[PDB]
Amino acid sequence: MTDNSNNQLVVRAKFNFQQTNEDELSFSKGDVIHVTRVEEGGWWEGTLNGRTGWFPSNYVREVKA
């Protein structure tokens, strides 16, 4: 509404990634994740249904419908 503008960066899971705790974000081929902090190459943080935490940028790719 305020911070989120100029089209949000949407990313889609590539490979089946496994989490370790509620601190890390889990995702499987298909589950979409909304980025909240996108840096210049590295680790990206996002949110998912019942799953919230950090996620790699190499196992995910910027998706756009």
Binding site: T20, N21, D23, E24, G41, G42, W43, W44, W54, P56, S57, N58, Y59
Partner: peptide
């Protein structure tokens, strides 16, 4: 399709890594 050799984002000894991750 072409899979990239570099798997998972890089994780140095500094900057990243917080409260230990797995």
């Amino acid at each position: 399709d072409a899979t990239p050799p570099p798997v998972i984002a890089p994780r140095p000894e500094h900057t990243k890594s917080v409260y230990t991750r797995s």
